[PDB]
DNA sequence: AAAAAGACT
DNA sequence: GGAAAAAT
C-alpha cells in the first residue's frame, strides 16, 4: 500500500477515523515463594506485598554502578518509607544494614532458567506473548490497519536517569486503568475497560497523533502511545521534516550573510543572537531550553550555555582565535571541541564573559524562544533543529558525488558509503532519498544497507527517488 | 509576556 | 538517540 501517492490531508485534523484495541499492563505482580529471604541488622524482617514488590526492583539492579551511587540510595530510603507500614519503618534507620543477597541468587537463577527451557518449552508461552501482538498490536484506521509501536504499558520500577540526575531511584509506580486516557472517534467500537475499573477520561481529539496517554508520577510529564514508524502519520511528518530542509537550500546563502552581518551590530540581544546561530550552524549544536534545576540533571545546550563552559585562546595549536567547549549535552555526554572561529566572533564572545561570575549565564538577554521567533520570520517551518538536518545531508550529496569510483567493482562503492557515513547520528538527520538517489545512479541493492526493519521506515523514499535526485 | 502543560532523537 | 535484553 502507498500513501504518498494519495491526497494529503491539510493542516489541522491528523486522522479521519481511529479504532484501537486498547493497551496491555504488566501481568499483576507475582509474589515471592517461601524460600526467598530479607536479612536486616542481624535479625530478619518480613515484607508486605507492596514492599515486596519494590524489593524486586532493587534486586533487578544490584551489581550496577547505580547502587554505588549516593543520590540513588538517598531517594530509595525516602520512596521506601511510603511503600510499607508504620511498624516496619519504626526500626529501620540505615540502608547499610540490609541484605538483598538471597533475592540476588534468585533473580540471577531466574535469568538462567529461561536458558534451560527446551526447544518446545521456549515456544509454549513464547507463542502466547505473540498472541498479544496480533490482538492488541494492530489498530484500524482510515485506509488499512497500522501497527502500534508500544502497546505494552511501562511496568513499575525505578528511575534510571543519566549522569547526576537528582530524581534517580524514585518510585515510578504501577499505572492503573484509571490513569489512562483513551483517544478515538465517537462512532467507533470503544475499548472495554479492564474488569471493574474505569478510565480517567476519553477524548475524541482528532488533532493528535496518539491513542493512549497517562501521566508520570515522578516529573509530571505526559507519556504517550503512538504508532509504528512505518505509518502514514509517523512517516508524513518525517517526509515533511526532510521537505523542510529542502526549502532551506536556497535561503541558506542569505541566512549566513544575515547573521555574519549581525556580528558588527549595535545592540546586546542582536549581537547575542548571531553568535549562537553561528554555533548551531557550524558546531552542529542543540538549542538547550530552560531546565528545572532540582528537577533534572544539569545539562546545557546552546542558549543555556554558561561562562564556566567556555575557555578562549588567541593562538592555540598553530591556529588563531580558538574556543574550547567543555560541557555535558543530552544523555550527559561530554562535548569537547577546540574549535577555531572568525575574528569578530571571538571579540564578541570576550565581551559577554566581561564582569560576570562563572555560575551565571553566558547569553544574558537570550533564550530559545527569541532564537526560534527570529528563525520563523526568516522562513516558514524553520527551527533551530533544521540545521542539524540540513548540514548533515548536503554533505552526503557532495560526498556521494566524488568518493565513488566510476569503473569500480562491488564493495568498492559501499566502502565509500560508510566513508561518507563516517563524515560527521546515522539513523536520524540524513535524508534517505539521497542514499536511494545514489543507489540507482550507480545501482546498489537496498537490502544490503537497510535491513527489513529499516526498509520499513524508508518505504516512502524507496518509491520516490530516481537516478538523479539532487537535494 | 511569561509559565506551565502537551505533544512528538 | 542510548542502554540493555534477545535473536569453534
Helices and strands, with pairings:
Layout: E1 39-40, E2 43-44, H1 51-59, H2 70-78, H3 88-91, E3 98-99, H4 101-112, H5 121-124, H6 131-135, E4 138-139, E5 146-147, E6 181-183, E7 201-203, E8 212-215, E9 222-225, H7 232-246, H8 252-261, H9 268-282, E10 310-316, E11 319-328, E12 334-340, H10 343-350, H11 368-378, H12 386-402, H13 414-420, H14 432-443, H15 454-457, H16 459-462
Parallel strand pairs: 6-7
Antiparallel strand pairs: 1-2, 1-3, 4-5, 6-8, 8-9, 10-11, 11-12
Helix pairs in contact: 7-12
The chain binds two DNA strands through residues 160, 162, 208-210, 213, 220-222, 224, 226, 234, 237, 290, 330-331, 333, 369, 385, 425, 427-429.
Describe the structure.
The protein is of the alpha+beta class and 471 residues long. It has 4 domains: 34-117, Yeast DNA topoisomerase - domain 1 (Arc Repressor Mutant, subunit A); 118-228, DNA Topoisomerase I, domain 2 (Beta Complex), CATH 2.170.11.10; 229-378, Alpha-Beta Complex (Topoisomerase I, Chain A, domain 3), CATH 3.90.15.10; 389-470, Topoisomerase I, Chain A, domain 4 (Orthogonal Bundle). It contains 16 helices and 12 strands. The protein has helices at 51-59, 70-78, 88-91, 101-112, 121-124, 131-135, 232-246, 252-261, 268-282, 343-350, 368-378, 386-402, 414-420, 432-443, 454-457, 459-462, and strands at 39-40, 43-44, 98-99, 138-139, 146-147, 181-183, 201-203, 212-215, 222-225, 310-316, 319-328, 334-340. A 4-stranded mixed sheet has the order 7-6-8-9, with no helix packed on it. A 3-stranded antiparallel sheet has the order 2-1-3, with no helix packed on it. Strands 10-11-12 form a 3-stranded antiparallel sheet, with helices on one face. Helix 7 (232-246) packs across helix 12. The chain binds 2 DNA strands through residues 160, 162, 208-210, 213, 220-222, 224, 226, 234, 237, 290, 330-331, 333, 369, 385, 425, 427-429. It is classed as isomerase/dna. Keywords: Ara-C, protein-DNA complex, DNA damage, isomerase, isomerase-DNA complex.
